[PDB]
Design a protein around this ligand. Structure first.
Ligand SMILES: C[C@@]1(C(=O)Nc2ccc(F)nc2)CCCN1c1nc(Nc2cc(C3CC3)n[nH]2)c2cccn2n1
Length: 296
Protein backbone atom coordinates (compact mmCIF):
# COMPACT_ATOMS: atom_id res chain seq x y z
CA UNK A 1 0.00 0.00 0.00
CA UNK A 2 1.27 3.46 -1.11
CA UNK A 3 4.08 4.14 -3.64
CA UNK A 4 6.87 6.62 -2.79
CA UNK A 5 8.54 8.21 -5.90
CA UNK A 6 12.35 7.73 -6.09
CA UNK A 7 15.34 8.35 -8.48
CA UNK A 8 13.69 5.97 -11.05
CA UNK A 9 10.88 8.54 -11.68
CA UNK A 10 10.88 9.76 -15.33
CA UNK A 11 8.85 12.74 -16.72
CA UNK A 12 5.83 11.85 -18.94
CA UNK A 13 7.05 14.13 -21.83
CA UNK A 14 10.19 11.92 -22.21
CA UNK A 15 7.98 8.86 -23.06
CA UNK A 16 6.41 8.10 -26.50
CA UNK A 17 4.13 5.00 -26.82
CA UNK A 18 3.87 3.46 -30.34
CA UNK A 19 3.13 -0.19 -31.42
CA UNK A 20 1.49 -2.85 -29.18
CA UNK A 21 3.68 -5.70 -27.86
CA UNK A 22 0.98 -7.66 -26.01
CA UNK A 23 -1.37 -7.81 -23.00
CA UNK A 24 0.30 -7.66 -19.58
CA UNK A 25 -0.92 -8.52 -16.05
CA UNK A 26 -2.12 -4.95 -15.22
CA UNK A 27 -2.68 -3.64 -18.77
CA UNK A 28 -1.49 -3.31 -22.39
CA UNK A 29 2.29 -3.26 -23.03
CA UNK A 30 3.55 -1.01 -25.84
CA UNK A 31 6.90 -0.48 -27.55
CA UNK A 32 8.24 3.04 -28.16
CA UNK A 33 11.01 5.57 -27.48
CA UNK A 34 12.32 7.23 -24.30
CA UNK A 35 14.52 10.26 -23.53
CA UNK A 36 17.12 10.22 -20.73
CA UNK A 37 16.43 6.64 -19.49
CA UNK A 38 19.83 5.18 -20.55
CA UNK A 39 22.08 7.99 -19.19
CA UNK A 40 21.56 11.07 -21.47
CA UNK A 41 20.58 9.15 -24.69
CA UNK A 42 17.84 11.25 -26.40
CA UNK A 43 16.21 8.20 -28.09
CA UNK A 44 16.20 4.65 -26.65
CA UNK A 45 13.86 1.93 -27.99
CA UNK A 46 11.84 0.83 -24.93
CA UNK A 47 8.96 -1.42 -23.77
CA UNK A 48 6.24 0.49 -21.85
CA UNK A 49 3.99 -1.36 -19.35
CA UNK A 50 0.64 0.37 -18.67
CA UNK A 51 -2.31 0.11 -16.23
CA UNK A 52 -5.81 -0.12 -17.82
CA UNK A 53 -8.00 3.05 -17.55
CA UNK A 54 -10.73 1.18 -15.54
CA UNK A 55 -8.27 -0.04 -12.81
CA UNK A 56 -8.48 1.05 -9.13
CA UNK A 57 -5.83 2.96 -7.07
CA UNK A 58 -5.01 -0.33 -5.21
CA UNK A 59 -4.25 -2.00 -8.61
CA UNK A 60 -2.01 0.95 -9.72
CA UNK A 61 -0.07 0.81 -6.40
CA UNK A 62 0.22 -3.04 -6.70
CA UNK A 63 1.65 -2.63 -10.28
CA UNK A 64 4.28 -0.06 -9.14
CA UNK A 65 5.45 -2.06 -6.06
CA UNK A 66 5.57 -5.39 -8.01
CA UNK A 67 7.64 -3.72 -10.80
CA UNK A 68 9.96 -2.07 -8.18
CA UNK A 69 11.65 -5.50 -7.55
CA UNK A 70 13.53 -5.02 -10.91
CA UNK A 71 15.18 -1.78 -9.52
CA UNK A 72 17.65 -3.93 -7.47
CA UNK A 73 19.00 -5.67 -10.65
CA UNK A 74 21.88 -4.50 -12.91
CA UNK A 75 22.79 -7.47 -15.15
CA UNK A 76 23.35 -7.84 -18.92
CA UNK A 77 21.49 -11.21 -18.78
CA UNK A 78 18.39 -9.89 -16.90
CA UNK A 79 15.74 -7.60 -18.59
CA UNK A 80 16.36 -4.09 -17.14
CA UNK A 81 13.91 -1.61 -15.56
CA UNK A 82 14.66 1.85 -17.01
CA UNK A 83 12.03 4.18 -15.53
CA UNK A 84 8.73 4.68 -13.67
CA UNK A 85 5.90 7.15 -14.49
CA UNK A 86 3.79 7.15 -11.27
CA UNK A 87 2.84 10.88 -11.33
CA UNK A 88 -0.52 11.25 -13.09
CA UNK A 89 -2.15 8.83 -15.56
CA UNK A 90 -1.59 6.50 -17.48
CA UNK A 91 0.63 4.76 -14.86
CA UNK A 92 3.83 3.58 -16.63
CA UNK A 93 6.90 1.35 -15.99
CA UNK A 94 9.67 1.66 -18.62
CA UNK A 95 11.51 -1.57 -19.48
CA UNK A 96 14.37 -2.73 -21.75
CA UNK A 97 13.04 -3.73 -25.21
CA UNK A 98 13.36 -7.39 -26.32
CA UNK A 99 12.18 -7.37 -30.00
CA UNK A 100 12.15 -11.20 -30.45
CA UNK A 101 9.73 -11.91 -27.56
CA UNK A 102 9.87 -14.86 -25.16
CA UNK A 103 12.28 -17.82 -25.69
CA UNK A 104 9.35 -20.33 -25.91
CA UNK A 105 7.75 -18.17 -28.69
CA UNK A 106 11.18 -17.83 -30.41
CA UNK A 107 11.92 -21.61 -30.20
CA UNK A 108 8.45 -22.50 -31.59
CA UNK A 109 8.96 -19.98 -34.48
CA UNK A 110 12.07 -22.03 -35.53
CA UNK A 111 9.92 -25.22 -36.03
CA UNK A 112 9.47 -26.33 -39.71
CA UNK A 113 6.06 -25.29 -41.18
CA UNK A 114 5.02 -27.28 -46.24
CA UNK A 115 7.50 -27.87 -49.18
CA UNK A 116 9.32 -24.51 -48.53
CA UNK A 117 12.95 -24.66 -47.20
CA UNK A 118 13.64 -24.30 -43.48
CA UNK A 119 16.65 -23.30 -41.34
CA UNK A 120 18.32 -26.33 -39.69
CA UNK A 121 17.67 -26.67 -35.87
CA UNK A 122 19.97 -24.47 -33.66
CA UNK A 123 23.58 -25.77 -33.54
CA UNK A 124 25.23 -26.93 -30.26
CA UNK A 125 27.32 -23.67 -30.14
CA UNK A 126 24.10 -21.57 -30.48
CA UNK A 127 22.39 -23.72 -27.77
CA UNK A 128 25.43 -23.39 -25.38
CA UNK A 129 25.45 -19.57 -25.96
CA UNK A 130 21.75 -19.45 -24.88
CA UNK A 131 22.52 -21.80 -21.92
CA UNK A 132 25.40 -19.63 -20.61
CA UNK A 133 23.32 -16.42 -20.91
CA UNK A 134 20.33 -17.91 -18.98
CA UNK A 135 22.72 -19.45 -16.36
CA UNK A 136 24.56 -16.07 -15.98
CA UNK A 137 21.30 -14.17 -15.36
CA UNK A 138 20.32 -16.86 -12.84
CA UNK A 139 23.78 -16.84 -11.11
CA UNK A 140 23.35 -13.03 -10.71
CA UNK A 141 19.82 -13.46 -9.19
CA UNK A 142 21.11 -16.17 -6.76
CA UNK A 143 24.04 -13.90 -5.70
CA UNK A 144 21.47 -11.10 -5.06
CA UNK A 145 19.62 -13.54 -2.67
CA UNK A 146 16.75 -14.37 -5.11
CA UNK A 147 14.97 -17.67 -5.94
CA UNK A 148 13.18 -17.40 -9.35
CA UNK A 149 10.52 -20.17 -8.76
CA UNK A 150 9.30 -19.95 -12.43
CA UNK A 151 12.41 -20.48 -14.62
CA UNK A 152 11.23 -21.60 -18.10
CA UNK A 153 11.73 -20.67 -21.81
CA UNK A 154 8.42 -18.68 -21.64
CA UNK A 155 10.01 -16.56 -18.81
CA UNK A 156 13.21 -15.87 -20.81
CA UNK A 157 13.37 -13.08 -23.44
CA UNK A 158 15.24 -12.79 -26.78
CA UNK A 159 16.87 -9.46 -27.80
CA UNK A 160 17.40 -8.06 -31.37
CA UNK A 161 21.01 -9.45 -31.43
CA UNK A 162 19.64 -12.91 -30.24
CA UNK A 163 20.97 -12.49 -26.63
CA UNK A 164 18.74 -14.46 -24.22
CA UNK A 165 17.96 -12.80 -20.85
CA UNK A 166 15.87 -13.53 -17.72
CA UNK A 167 12.50 -11.93 -18.52
CA UNK A 168 10.27 -9.58 -16.51
CA UNK A 169 8.40 -11.22 -13.60
CA UNK A 170 4.68 -12.06 -13.81
CA UNK A 171 4.62 -11.10 -17.53
CA UNK A 172 4.23 -14.80 -18.51
CA UNK A 173 1.93 -16.16 -21.29
CA UNK A 174 -1.16 -15.37 -21.79
CA UNK A 175 -1.04 -18.24 -24.39
CA UNK A 176 0.78 -20.64 -21.96
CA UNK A 177 -2.08 -21.56 -19.50
CA UNK A 178 -1.33 -25.28 -20.21
CA UNK A 179 2.12 -24.84 -18.53
CA UNK A 180 0.35 -24.41 -15.11
CA UNK A 181 -1.68 -26.77 -12.87
CA UNK A 182 -3.90 -25.82 -9.87
CA UNK A 183 -1.04 -21.92 -9.88
CA UNK A 184 2.15 -24.07 -10.18
CA UNK A 185 4.39 -24.97 -13.19
CA UNK A 186 4.47 -28.76 -12.44
CA UNK A 187 6.36 -29.82 -15.64
CA UNK A 188 9.28 -27.45 -14.70
CA UNK A 189 9.29 -28.25 -10.91
CA UNK A 190 11.89 -30.24 -8.89
CA UNK A 191 10.74 -33.40 -6.94
CA UNK A 192 11.11 -31.52 -3.59
CA UNK A 193 8.97 -28.53 -4.79
CA UNK A 194 6.21 -30.95 -5.89
CA UNK A 195 6.43 -32.58 -2.38
CA UNK A 196 6.61 -29.65 0.14
CA UNK A 197 6.15 -26.55 -2.06
CA UNK A 198 9.61 -25.19 -1.10
CA UNK A 199 11.76 -23.54 -3.84
CA UNK A 200 15.54 -22.88 -3.64
CA UNK A 201 18.38 -22.05 -6.11
CA UNK A 202 18.78 -25.89 -6.47
CA UNK A 203 15.14 -26.16 -7.72
CA UNK A 204 15.89 -23.23 -10.13
CA UNK A 205 18.81 -25.39 -11.47
CA UNK A 206 16.28 -28.28 -12.04
CA UNK A 207 14.09 -25.81 -14.04
CA UNK A 208 17.23 -24.67 -15.99
CA UNK A 209 17.71 -28.33 -17.05
CA UNK A 210 14.12 -28.28 -18.42
CA UNK A 211 14.97 -24.96 -20.25
CA UNK A 212 17.92 -26.83 -21.95
CA UNK A 213 15.44 -29.62 -22.90
CA UNK A 214 13.06 -26.93 -24.33
CA UNK A 215 15.94 -25.46 -26.44
CA UNK A 216 16.85 -28.99 -27.76
CA UNK A 217 13.16 -29.87 -28.57
CA UNK A 218 12.20 -26.36 -29.89
CA UNK A 219 9.83 -25.70 -26.92
CA UNK A 220 7.96 -29.05 -26.82
CA UNK A 221 5.69 -29.76 -23.81
CA UNK A 222 7.85 -31.58 -21.17
CA UNK A 223 6.42 -35.10 -20.44
CA UNK A 224 4.10 -34.64 -23.52
CA UNK A 225 2.39 -38.06 -23.26
CA UNK A 226 1.56 -37.52 -19.55
CA UNK A 227 -1.20 -35.51 -17.82
CA UNK A 228 -0.40 -32.99 -14.99
CA UNK A 229 -1.29 -35.63 -12.31
CA UNK A 230 0.90 -38.26 -14.09
CA UNK A 231 3.81 -35.71 -14.27
CA UNK A 232 3.57 -35.16 -10.43
CA UNK A 233 3.90 -38.92 -9.69
CA UNK A 234 6.54 -39.61 -12.44
CA UNK A 235 8.96 -36.83 -11.32
CA UNK A 236 8.50 -37.56 -7.54
CA UNK A 237 9.16 -41.32 -8.21
CA UNK A 238 12.52 -40.48 -9.88
CA UNK A 239 11.38 -40.23 -13.51
CA UNK A 240 13.32 -38.10 -16.03
CA UNK A 241 12.77 -36.51 -19.48
CA UNK A 242 14.09 -38.54 -22.46
CA UNK A 243 17.17 -37.43 -24.45
CA UNK A 244 15.79 -35.30 -27.35
CA UNK A 245 16.24 -36.49 -30.96
CA UNK A 246 19.59 -35.24 -32.41
CA UNK A 247 20.52 -33.65 -29.00
CA UNK A 248 24.32 -33.89 -28.39
CA UNK A 249 25.31 -36.03 -25.34
CA UNK A 250 27.23 -33.00 -23.94
CA UNK A 251 23.97 -30.96 -23.61
CA UNK A 252 21.99 -33.97 -22.22
CA UNK A 253 24.74 -34.71 -19.60
CA UNK A 254 24.25 -31.09 -18.37
CA UNK A 255 20.44 -31.75 -18.19
CA UNK A 256 21.09 -34.96 -16.13
CA UNK A 257 23.34 -32.94 -13.72
CA UNK A 258 20.42 -30.47 -13.20
CA UNK A 259 18.02 -33.44 -12.82
CA UNK A 260 19.78 -35.13 -9.83
CA UNK A 261 17.11 -36.20 -7.27
CA UNK A 262 19.11 -34.77 -4.34
CA UNK A 263 19.05 -30.90 -4.65
CA UNK A 264 22.56 -30.70 -3.03
CA UNK A 265 24.00 -32.94 -5.84
CA UNK A 266 22.88 -30.54 -8.63
CA UNK A 267 25.56 -28.08 -9.89
CA UNK A 268 25.25 -24.37 -9.02
CA UNK A 269 24.59 -21.79 -11.80
CA UNK A 270 28.27 -20.69 -11.40
CA UNK A 271 29.36 -24.37 -11.82
CA UNK A 272 27.21 -24.61 -15.02
CA UNK A 273 28.86 -21.47 -16.58
CA UNK A 274 32.35 -22.79 -15.56
CA UNK A 275 31.82 -26.05 -17.53
CA UNK A 276 30.74 -24.11 -20.71
CA UNK A 277 32.75 -20.78 -20.44
CA UNK A 278 35.26 -21.91 -23.15
CA UNK A 279 32.34 -22.28 -25.65
CA UNK A 280 30.82 -18.81 -24.98
CA UNK A 281 31.37 -15.89 -27.44
CA UNK A 282 34.49 -13.75 -26.55
CA UNK A 283 32.15 -10.86 -25.60
CA UNK A 284 30.73 -12.91 -22.65
CA UNK A 285 33.95 -12.25 -20.62
CA UNK A 286 33.15 -8.47 -20.79
CA UNK A 287 29.33 -8.44 -20.19
CA UNK A 288 28.58 -11.43 -17.86
CA UNK A 289 28.05 -11.41 -14.07
CA UNK A 290 30.40 -14.49 -14.01
CA UNK A 291 33.43 -12.40 -15.10
CA UNK A 292 32.43 -9.18 -13.19
CA UNK A 293 33.96 -8.08 -9.83
CA UNK A 294 30.52 -8.74 -8.18
CA UNK A 295 31.08 -12.53 -8.50
CA UNK A 296 33.36 -13.20 -5.47
C1 LIG B 1 4.45 -7.56 -23.54
C2 LIG B 1 4.60 -9.09 -23.34
C3 LIG B 1 5.67 -9.45 -22.25
O1 LIG B 1 5.87 -8.68 -21.31
N1 LIG B 1 6.30 -10.65 -22.45
C4 LIG B 1 7.13 -11.27 -21.57
C5 LIG B 1 7.07 -12.66 -21.30
C6 LIG B 1 7.92 -13.29 -20.40
C7 LIG B 1 8.85 -12.47 -19.77
F1 LIG B 1 9.66 -13.11 -18.90
N2 LIG B 1 8.94 -11.12 -20.00
C8 LIG B 1 8.10 -10.52 -20.89
C9 LIG B 1 3.31 -9.72 -22.82
C10 LIG B 1 2.98 -10.95 -23.66
C11 LIG B 1 3.72 -10.72 -24.96
N3 LIG B 1 4.74 -9.75 -24.65
C12 LIG B 1 5.72 -9.46 -25.53
N4 LIG B 1 6.77 -8.71 -25.15
C13 LIG B 1 7.77 -8.41 -26.04
N5 LIG B 1 8.85 -7.64 -25.66
C14 LIG B 1 9.23 -7.12 -24.34
C15 LIG B 1 8.62 -7.20 -23.05
C16 LIG B 1 9.42 -6.50 -22.10
C17 LIG B 1 9.20 -6.29 -20.58
C18 LIG B 1 8.31 -5.12 -20.83
C19 LIG B 1 7.73 -6.43 -20.43
N6 LIG B 1 10.46 -6.03 -22.83
N7 LIG B 1 10.35 -6.39 -24.13
C20 LIG B 1 7.76 -8.86 -27.37
C21 LIG B 1 8.64 -8.72 -28.50
C22 LIG B 1 8.03 -9.43 -29.53
C23 LIG B 1 6.82 -9.98 -29.03
N8 LIG B 1 6.66 -9.64 -27.72
N9 LIG B 1 5.67 -9.91 -26.80
Amino acid sequence: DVYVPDEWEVAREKITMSRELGQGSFGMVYEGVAKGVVKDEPETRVAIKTVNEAASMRERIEFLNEASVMKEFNCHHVVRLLGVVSQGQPTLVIMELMTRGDLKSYLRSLRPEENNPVLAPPSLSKMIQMAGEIADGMAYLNANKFVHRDLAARNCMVAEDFTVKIGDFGMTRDIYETDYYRLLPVRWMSPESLKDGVFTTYSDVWSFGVVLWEIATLAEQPYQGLSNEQVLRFVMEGGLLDKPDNCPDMLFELMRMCWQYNPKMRPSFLEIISSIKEEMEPGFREVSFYYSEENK
